[PDB]
Design a protein around this nucleic acid. Structure first.
Ligand SMILES: Nc1ncnc2[nH]cnc12
Ligand SMILES: Nc1ncnc2[nH]cnc12
Lengths: 338, 338
DNA sequence: TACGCAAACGTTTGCGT
DNA sequence: TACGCAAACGTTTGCGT
């Protein structure tokens, strides 16, 4: 079809190609004609032909876990924005934590020859780490590790641990000593790490978390629902709860309300993530905010680097969580005694 | 690189290609060797080379509005699932209702030669309809029109109007006669259409909606916040409110609570969409459910058709909303008198 | 039997002059 | 000056025998 353009214009396809890509000077007259042709002929330059030669698709692959989750969903929108402003095309892939599925998308991806890979799989078993390595040749960054599990990738790190600690400290400083916790999956960083950061501050204040007071969630609202329930559904109950993720907290809030408990009046609750509409939870959610937009742009940027400035060395950037006081926490029994 | 495989194997690339695609019988011995080579050499068959010849990318483009919105986000996850099971790759694009951006993604798309196009732009001005047509050659379906605006596309239709009517009828049948409404953008179907379906049932019952009682939203929680506020912030206030979308309702719920109003005790509220976690709103949201998973798979299926069975004729499939009784509505003053 | 040779897909880019 | 000829990117697929 470039041939068809070249001819309506009576110039070489070499010419057409030069004007289309402004890769060398061309007589105005010449240029104009080409355009004209380009027009009537209604021409769409084929990227597949072009990638074939130039050796890059100008497309990036996001191997995510799920895209419905508020959390994820906001990161993704971030990455896309960046791709679109620097000309990259985004191929989105949800593997749902299924190895098979993962082996599958990873491969469809190498085959489509994406220029780089954005990895966000939540959990990383050796079997997965292993697969990841087989594509070390394709540039990539894992946006969700705690530390740097590997040497064949870039990593953006969230300091989930320090978020966990911040959360606990707030509770402590508000007068709370009987606290509970619904962590997210321990196999995940945002799960295990947030919890641990939380457990430290407790030890620091000699608070002890009765196991009957910690209930695993899975970042889904229903998990929050059940957890809270189970917590308050007991003889002795905490006065404050740390919830591993906003959406689960949303669930925690519903159950309380359903048991006729008042928040923060009966139970104080603090979450984590600061999802776009946590401010509109009822009551307005007090949480630890995770820089999602920056977590995304930061990742996109390391990749581009590696892509463009052909980097070889693994890199890692830290990002920082911060506390957001809203209205779901109230002073606890010891506020006055400090 | 296929050449490199062919040689480690001492067979023709024609052979390699045949075994890789099982396109003709090959001696086990032969086959095996090829694999062997395929292995050590660590081979990734290039899809770009292949698409170049076979003429299809086996990739589909979703030109959406935004992917953060709960609503959207759930549809998208649906479409992706379908793509992944039928081998298609999903290229996601958010145009945010910006023509320019739209002209941009549309073009990057034709150029990447996607096999088909999934359109979900919320609002369709002639200028946009116009652009869309210039790509009538690429197969596509618009998943969000009310009626069939064009002849050069497939359309999946939601019956938003009948959702609107259902909503109103419920309110009426619960004893409500003083109702308010926060519609979504009138330029959009889910906006204008839901409202109109709602206005009909009103006329039918001779209920009259005082303009001071209808406040436009934009599907975003803050719009709900402000609207509700403005509604209840007045001398005379309705006893029930129809909210154009769940997320806005979420906002409506927050404000009420903030003015110390009780739901549904002081104000009854009913939304629309039945987003994944409306059940966990406080209180559990009563809403009209939009079949999102089916809205997605249905769209993917018309496209595949057109793609595969090379259809030419425009088609349209209707989908149906349905009411979900949760706990945000209470009987109104006239319940007993019917 | 079971497999090869060679042209083609639509570009970009080196040398020409 | 301002532009062309022709080879190459990595495949698939028609005919061969
Ligand atoms: N895996 C996860 N899923 C959903 N929200 C999250 N927030 C932090 N980690 C998350
Ligand atoms: N345009 C839109 N945005 C967000 N949620 C919606 N639900 C219905 N239409 C919507």
């Amino acid at each position: 079809t470039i041939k068809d353009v070249a001819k309506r214009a009576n110039v070489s396809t070499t010419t057409v190609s030069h004007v289309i890509n402004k890769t060398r000077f061309v007589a105005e007259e010449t240029r104009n004609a080409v355009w004209a042709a380009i027009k009537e002929l209604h021409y769409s330059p084929s990227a597949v032909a072009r990638s074939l030669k130039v050796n890059h698709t100008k497309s990036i692959g996001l191997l995510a876990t799920s895209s419905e989750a508020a959390y994820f969903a906001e990161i993704i929108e971030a990455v896309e924005k960046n791709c679109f402003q620097k000309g990259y095309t985004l191929i989105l892939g949800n593997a749902w934590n299924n190895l098979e599925k993962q082996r599958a998308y990873l491969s469809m991806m190498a085959q489509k020859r994406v220029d780089g890979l954005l990895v966000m799989c939540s959990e990383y078993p050796e079997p997965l780490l292993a697969m990841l390595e087989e594509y070390r040749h394709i540039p990539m960054v894992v946006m969700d590790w705690g530390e740097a599990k590997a040497d064949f990738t870039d990593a953006v790190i969230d300091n989930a641990f320090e978020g966990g600690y911040m959360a606990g400290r707030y509770l402590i400083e508000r007068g709370h000593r009987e606290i509970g916790v619904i962590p997210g999956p321990l196999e995940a960083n945002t799960g295990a790490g947030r919890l641990a950061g939380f457990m430290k501050a407790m030890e620091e204040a000699m608070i002890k978390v009765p196991e009957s007071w910690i209930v695993q969630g899975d970042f889904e609202p229903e998990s929050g629902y059940r957890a809270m329930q189970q917590i308050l559904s007991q003889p002795h109950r905490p006065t404050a709860v740390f919830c591993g993720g906003d959406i689960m907290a949303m669930g925690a809030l519903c159950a309380a309300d359903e048991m006729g408990l008042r928040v923060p009046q009966d139970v104080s609750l603090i979450g984590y993530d600061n999802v776009r509409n946590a401010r509109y939870f009822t009551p307005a959610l007090t949480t630890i905010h995770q820089p999602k937009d920056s977590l995304g742009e930061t990742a996109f940027n390391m990749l581009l680097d590696r892509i463009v400035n052909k980097r070889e060395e693994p890199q890692s950037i830290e990002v920082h969580p911060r506390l957001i006081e809203r209205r779901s926490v109230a002073d606890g029994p010891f506020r006055d005694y400090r």
